[PDB]
């Protein structure tokens, strides 16, 4: 907050999200060390970019899931 602009990082994990059906997730990114809270980035087919904590179960499995999805179809990760 120097003078103009009240933002901070395109995707900052200020808090944690709620449980969401893995069937809605399409991709999962990672929080930037220069963005906000070191969490996880969840992207859904509906352009849903939320920040979930790695501890969250739905996230642990959600990840192990997409791990065997991206590869499929197109083997160009």
Domain boundaries, given as residue ranges, for the chain: 1-77
Tokens of 14: 């200020």
Tokens of 3: 């003078």
Confirm or reject CATH 3.40.50.300 for domain 1-77, answering yes or no: no
User: Which residues lie closer than 8 Å to 22 by C-beta, 6 or more apart?
Assistant: 58, 61, 62, 65
The total of other beta-carbon atoms located within 10 Å of residue 36's CB is 16
25 close to 52: Cβ distance less than 8 angstroms: no
């Amino acid at each position: 907050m120097q003078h103009h602009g009240v933002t901070k990082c395109n995707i900052t994990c200020s808090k944690m999200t709620s449980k969401i059906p893995v069937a809605l997730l399409i991709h999962y990114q990672q929080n930037q060390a220069s963005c906000g809270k070191r969490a996880i980035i969840l992207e859904t087919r509906q352009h849903r970019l939320f920040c979930a904590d790695p501890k969250e179960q739905w996230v642990k499995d959600a990840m192990q899931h997409l791990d065997r999805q991206a590869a499929a179809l197109t083997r160009n990760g």
